[PDB]
Amino acid sequence: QAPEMLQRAREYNARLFGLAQRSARALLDYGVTADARALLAGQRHLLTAQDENGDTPLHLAIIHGQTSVIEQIVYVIHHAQDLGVVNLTNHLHQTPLHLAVITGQTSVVSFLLRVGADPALLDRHGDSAMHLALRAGAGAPELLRALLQSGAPAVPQLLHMPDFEGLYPVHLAVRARSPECLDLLVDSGAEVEATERQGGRTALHLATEMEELGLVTHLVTKLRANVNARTFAGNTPLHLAAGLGYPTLTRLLLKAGADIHAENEEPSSFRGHTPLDLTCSTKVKTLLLNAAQNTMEP
Amino acid sequence: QAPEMLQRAREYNARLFGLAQRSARALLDYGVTADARALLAGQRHLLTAQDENGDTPLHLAIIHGQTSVIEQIVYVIHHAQDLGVVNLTNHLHQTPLHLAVITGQTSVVSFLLRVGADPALLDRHGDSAMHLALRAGAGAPELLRALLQSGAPAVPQLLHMPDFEGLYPVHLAVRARSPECLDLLVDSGAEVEATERQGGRTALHLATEMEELGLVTHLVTKLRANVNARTFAGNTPLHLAAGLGYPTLTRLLLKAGADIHAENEEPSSFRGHTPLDLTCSTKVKTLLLNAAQNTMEP
């Protein structure tokens, strides 16, 4: 608090002078190797430098596909134990990985994973490395591949849940109308009958929901998914289908071994609406009845 | 002298912090351009960094033919008015130019000249850019060309004088047994009858000296060099030739219009040794006499 403030200012010139002085030495190496890496290492203690958007130098390189750079930068980080800088988030709370995925640069995505980079870190919207992949203006399971293949902290992703009422990765695929990924996840370990926190729905529920007749079949068949699973509001896929008026879908579900016996809520003593109830499509009504009385029925 | 030393330490952190902070910004540019130049500019205030041998980063690049680097480095220097760093000498008192020449990298030699780099600066031995060129384990006039062509501070070189008794560039060429350069110099302006500070000798003197019959002829003929020129010790080429015992050379000189009339020093009243005197070769003696009495003689 007194003229002892000097010790503070002088101390800075100590550990710092070495910095500026280290560069000077590294700059001499670059003059005998033309190796931009060495010249980049000299400023190692700077790769953490943010910007107007809070993007580290490595953050920008991934943004402008400067693959050449990302190569070097990562080298410096890896060979310096500073394997933490590769996680610094920008103002949007995005990590280098996050971007490599958002930009679709699968090549880089793999590279980052090799050295640190926790794919568990969510973004401003609460989406992890995987979650982001499962999305795309057009779609691309190619990303999900890089992740799944190699990466110790990668196996947990296929069990997380996004901000939006926590829709596990398996749920996302269905919402992404992409069975390609659906298999990718489940195959490499993934709870098929996962129950999300919103309405306790499952893959089949969202499938029948958006009437993804394709996914629905693919799920109940190959994926050996549980056909009769009730949601939080007590509803099986055979319900949503009938309600929405999805003939072929209802038919497919029925054949899949869908028990017509089910009651969501009132129209022990506690019965309620059944599949054969909520239906505004003449076609749907028919099958529901015919398939009920005929073949196995009191 | 009192706890006011603080202002000193704190001040350093002022103008310097911007440095380390500038790099940080330049390092962000490199992450969006992969341009090593920008990353090199960020450390501009370091290109002056010496080393164990006192070699600047640009000094090393020229040493290890890192042409790629030299390209960038010079750009930074040029576009920063720091056109003085390109003159910093190493421990051997050598400038970037000096090396570009010593290493024979003609390409670089030209490049340096374009931006500053005073070819007038001598080295540990007192040799300028030109002086060095006029030398080589095998020889190379290709260097002298780069210099002569383009370069405002280049025209003065062809009038300087090396440490060794100041032997002007024209003298060097003769000592380099290279008429190629001899012409190169004279053609682009160069005193032919230049008299060095040692023995006041001239091109012809050194020519006849090392008996460069080739140069001798080339000099007295095309170069229209003065045939009868006495040194400090009062001696014309016709002297040295006779003394050494160079028949054809003496003959060539004679025909060149070499006046037999000449006296160095005693064997108004003040006569001394003449060409026809100092001679241990029977052959030489003959011509000297025959050519004297015969054709024009009292």
- HEC sequence for chain A: CCCCCHHHHHHHHHHHHHHHHHHHHHHHHHHHHCCHHHHHHCCHHHCCCCCCCCCCHHHHHHHCCCHHHHHHHHHHHHCCCCCCHHHCCCCCCCCHHHHHHHCCCHHHHHHHHHCCCCCCCCCCCCCCHHHHHCCCCCCCHHHHHHHHCCCHHHCCCCCCCCCCCCCCHHHHHHHCCCHHHHHHHHHCCCCCCCCCCCCCCCHHHHHHHCCCHHHHHHHHCCCCCCCCCCCCCCCCHHHHHHHHCCHHHHHHHHHCCCCCCCCCCCCCCCCCCCCCCCCCCHHHHHHHHHHHHCCCCC
Of residues B9, B24, B69, nearest to A31 (C-beta): B69
How far A186 CA sits from the closest chain B CA (Å)? 38
Q: Which pair of structure tokens corresponds to residue B239?
A: 């002297």
Torsion of CA A271, A272, A276, A282, to 10 degrees: 150
Burial label for A138, CB within 10 Å (0-12, 13-18, 19+), is exposed
Q: What angle do CA A181, A186, A190 make, to 5 degrees?
A: 125
> Inter-axis angle of helices A6-33 and B6-33, to 10 degrees?
40
Exposure on the CB side of residue A195, measured as CA atoms within 13 A: 11
Which of B1, B4, B5, B6 to mutate to test binding with chain A, by most A CBs within 10 Å of its CB? B6
C-beta of residue A23 within 8 angstroms of C-beta of residue B43: yes
- Counting every residue written for chain A, the total comes to 298
Q: How far apart are CA B95 and CA B77, in angstroms?
A: 15
Q: Do residue A9 and residue B6 have CB atoms under 8 angstroms apart?
A: yes
Give the determination technique: X-ray
C-beta of residue A143 within 8 angstroms of C-beta of residue A106: yes
Which residues on chain A are in Cβ contact (under 8 Å) with B24?
Answer: 43, 46, 49
How far A28 CA sits from the closest chain B CA (Å)? 5
Q: How far apart are CA B157 and CA A83, in angstroms?
A: 56
Q: Which of B234, B214, B146, B137 is nearest to B174 (CA)?
A: B214
How far A45 CA sits from the closest chain B CA (Å)? 9
C-beta of residue A29 within 8 angstroms of C-beta of residue A41: no
Q: If DSSP states are collapsed to H, E and C, what string results for A59-80?
A: HHHHHCCCHHHHHHHHHHHHCC
Q: Does A15 touch chain B (CB under 8 A)?
A: no
Q: How far apart are CA A82 and CA A280, in angstroms?
A: 63
Q: How far apart are CA A182 and CA B225, in angstroms?
A: 95
Note the Cα B207 to chain centre separation in Å: 18
Which of A25, A47, A69 to mutate to test binding with chain B, by most B CBs within 10 Å of its CB? A69
Q: In chain B, which residue's Cα lies nearest the Cα of A55?
A: B28
Q: Do residue B31 and residue A59 have CB atoms under 8 angstroms apart?
A: yes
- Counting every residue written for chain B, the total comes to 298
Q: In chain A, which residue's Cα lies nearest the Cα of B5?
A: A6
Which of B16, B17, B33, B46 to mutate to test binding with chain A, by most A CBs within 10 Å of its CB? B46
Q: What angle do CA B41, B42, B44 make, to 5 degrees?
A: 55
Which of B8, B16, B25, B32 to mutate to test binding with chain A, by most A CBs within 10 Å of its CB? B32
Instruction: Give the Cβ contact number of residue A20 at 10 Å.
Output: 19
Of residues B28, B46, B68, nearest to A49 (C-beta): B28
How far B189 CA sits from the closest chain A CA (Å)? 37
Distances (CA, A) of A271 to A235, A244, A265: 13, 21, 7
Q: How far apart are CA B278 and CA B233, in angstroms?
A: 15
Q: Which resolution, in Å, applies to this structure?
A: 3.3
Q: In chain A, which residue's Cα lies nearest the Cα of B29?
A: A57
Q: Does B39 touch chain A (CB under 8 A)?
A: yes
| Single-letter residue type at B50 | Q
Phi-psi region of B211 (alpha: psi -120 to 50; beta: other; left: phi over 0): left
Which residues on chain B are in Cβ contact (under 8 Å) with A32?
Answer: 60-61, 63-64, 66
Sign of torsion over alpha carbons B30, B31, B33, B36: positive
Of residues B3, B28, B63, nearest to A6 (C-beta): B3
Sign of torsion over alpha carbons B251, B255, B258, B261: positive
Q: How far apart are CA A255 and CA A241, in angstroms?
A: 14
Burial label for B14, CB within 10 Å (0-12, 13-18, 19+), is exposed
Q: Which pair of structure tokens corresponds to residue B102?
A: 């010593």
The domains of chain B are located at 1-298
Which residues on chain B are in Cβ contact (under 8 Å) with A96?
Answer: none
Sign of torsion over alpha carbons B156, B158, B160, B162: positive
Q: Do residue A28 and residue B57 have CB atoms under 8 angstroms apart?
A: yes
| Single-letter residue type at A42 | G
Sign of torsion over alpha carbons A153, A158, A164, A166: negative
Give φ, ψ of B56 to 5 degrees: -65, 160
C-beta of residue B246 within 8 angstroms of C-beta of residue B237: no
C-beta of residue B174 within 8 angstroms of C-beta of residue B182: yes
Q: How far apart are CA A38 and CA A28, in angstroms?
A: 9
C-beta of residue B64 within 8 angstroms of C-beta of residue A32: yes
Q: Do residue B31 and residue A6 have CB atoms under 8 angstroms apart?
A: no
User: Would you list the DSSP string of chain B?
Assistant: --TTTHHHHHHHHHHHHHHHHHHHHHHHHHHHH--HHHHHHTTGGGTT---TT---HHHHHHHTT-HHHHHHHHHHHHTTT-TTGGG---TT---HHHHHHHTT-HHHHHHHHHS---TT---TTS--HHHHHT--SS--HHHHHHHHSS-GGGTTTTT---TTT---HHHHHHHTT-HHHHHHHHHTS--TT---TTT---HHHHHHHTT-HHHHHHHHTTT---SS---TTS--HHHHHHHHT-HHHHHHHHHTT--S----S---------TTTS---HHHHHHHHHHHHSSS--
